[PDB]
Amino acid sequence: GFLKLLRLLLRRQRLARAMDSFPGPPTHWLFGHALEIQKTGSLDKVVTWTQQFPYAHPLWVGQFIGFLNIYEPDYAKAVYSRGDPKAPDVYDFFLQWIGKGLLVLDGPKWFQHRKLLTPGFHYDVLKPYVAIFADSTRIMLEKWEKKACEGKSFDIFSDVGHMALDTLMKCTFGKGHRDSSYYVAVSELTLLMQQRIDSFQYHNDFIYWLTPHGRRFLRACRAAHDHTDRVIRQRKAALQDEKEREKHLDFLDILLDVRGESGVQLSDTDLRAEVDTFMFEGHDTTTSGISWFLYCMALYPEHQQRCREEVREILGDQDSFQWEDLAKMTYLTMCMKECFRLYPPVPQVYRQLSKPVSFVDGRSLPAGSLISLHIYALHRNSDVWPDPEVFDPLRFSPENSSGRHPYAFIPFSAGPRNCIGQQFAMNEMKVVTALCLLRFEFSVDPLRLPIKLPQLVLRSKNGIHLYLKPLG
Ligand code: HEM
Ligand SMILES: CCCCCCCC
């Protein structure tokens, strides 16, 4: 016991000593910066800090843990190109929920899984998914036409979430109620876990699970685990009749190691972790992305009208979009990237340096130091983006992006730990969002504007309330 107290106090002095090269905002004697972080709009407060301290600034939860918040393309590249492990202080809070899956793994075992699961987001696996996206969206759009003609605005986030979760499971988990029960549990898990990240008194494992906060997290963990245990058994059992006919495997079948070709033999815990992991990752983010996009289309009726007639032309007289049609959606894509710049679905990720790093401006950090990549501020950096807060899709035209720094716009991160599902996501969001524009015209609700709420992914304190006009 005495050993551990000392272990921590030295680590904090170390972390502090390594960022003395980095000025930053004032620290409360107990809370560090937590009182600023916990305020509504703290993302914009970090953006102002960005302009007062260039490249990076220290960031403390509560006097024991301090990160170097980084928000500059060279600083990002210096760190996120290399593959240092995920910050244990943050990602260990995943353990009771998603465990040591791909997101949290740190080393040669991560590369094994990454090598195993990358096939499965290859475009030959994703080509059939286009039909499924279209079907899932048509169900959601059927409900929205009833809501629209009621004349009231309504929150689209939960509806998109239920559609995202359903399409994920039809595409990658074998699916051909209790699902809603899972959806509500993710909400609790991400809410609670985000609050744990921001609340230093909840950091210690032993203490945390004596608190109502931690117990509530554990009840949601069980709720999540029941869901993924059912998904696994349902598939294992469905492969008694249909194994011959499927044999380019989808994600869950790869894990189940049909054909014995994977040759890595996953444990039951490792299998359940990856299912847990990709079940959070493959729906929560695209829910945020799609929802925030449709809001952007409402905020800027010129841009969505352009997107609408673009996809209207691409579709023509087809029944549904084909995988080949997704490339033609060049203007939809640029509006989407500009949405993700301002409304990045994952605002903040973290690493713990395994090796020292030296930055472009001369400063450096030793191994063991904690990094906080602030994608939100990075995407609003005034030294990189003229008129940062302005929404201009033409920033991502072929001309204006030709010589842009590679780590300037990284909503899917970058490097060896980049998003594995990026092309899954991009394909899904383009199909969903294109069919949304062919079917409705979206407009703000001036009384109920969204307020940004970090919740691991980017959510809104009050949903995304929109008015929908049906279309011929
Ligand atoms: C799983 C999964 C990973 C981890 C890959 C690995 O560790 O090999 C992943 C990564 C990311 C990251 C980096 C996370 C970090 O730095 O801690 C970001 C920022 C991000 C963002 C988005 N992702 Fe993702 N992603 C994983 C899974 C998925 C899936 C699953 C099928 C989809 C779909 C997807 C989509 C998106 C997305 C879409 C709007 C954003 C933003 N990710 N991912
Ligand atoms: C610390 C938040 C990590 C969220 C990553 C989600 C990847 C889809």
Q: For residues 93 and 80, what is the distance between their CA atoms, to the nearest angstrom? A: 21
Choose the residue to mutate in 194, 292, 419 for probing ligand 1, maximizing ligand atoms within 8 Å of C-beta.
419
Specify the 3-state DSSP secondary structure of 450.
coil
- Contact present, 338 and 391 (Cβ < 8 Å): yes
> Which two structure tokens, joined as six digits, stand for 399?
């001309």
Name beta bridge partners: 67.
Answer: 59
The 8-class DSSP code of residue 72 comes to S
Structural domain tally of the chain? 1
- Contact present, 255 and 268 (Cβ < 8 Å): no
Q: For residues 367 and 18, what is the distance between their CA atoms, to the nearest angstrom? A: 10
Tell me, rounded to whole angstroms, the distance of Cα 233 from its chain centroid: 27
The stretches of 211-267 forming alpha helices (DSSP H) are 212-238, 243-246, 251-256
Q: How far is the CA of 102 from the centre of ligand 1 (A)?
A: 10
Q: How far is the CA of 217 from the centre of ligand 1 (A)?
A: 22
As a whole number of Å, the CA-based R_g of the chain is: 22
Q: Residue 105 half-sphere exposure, CB side, CA atoms within 13 Å?
A: 17
**Residue stretches of the annotated binding site for heme:** 281, 419
- Contact present, 392 and 326 (Cβ < 8 Å): no
Resolution (angstroms) equals 2.7
Q: For residues 170 and 164, what is the distance between their CA atoms, to the nearest angstrom? A: 10
Which residue type occupies 99? G
Which technique was the structure solved with, according to the deposited record?
X-ray
β-strands 370-374, 66-70 pairing: parallel
Q: How far is the CA of 420 from the centre of ligand 1 (A)?
A: 6
Residue bearing tokens 């490249």: 55
Q: Whose CA is nearest to atom 8 of ligand 2?
A: 281
Q: For residues 263 and 283, what is the distance between their CA atoms, to the nearest angstrom? A: 28
Q: For residues 20 and 144, what is the distance between their CA atoms, to the nearest angstrom? A: 54
Ligand 2 binding pocket (C-beta < 6 A) is 90, 281, 285, 346, 349, 456
Q: Whose CA is nearest to atom 12 of ligand 1?
A: 419
The stretches of 72-156 forming alpha helices (DSSP H) are 73-80, 88-91, 108-117, 123-126, 129-148
Provide the residue range defining the domain that includes 275.
Answer: 1-472
> Which two structure tokens, joined as six digits, stand for 417?
């730990």
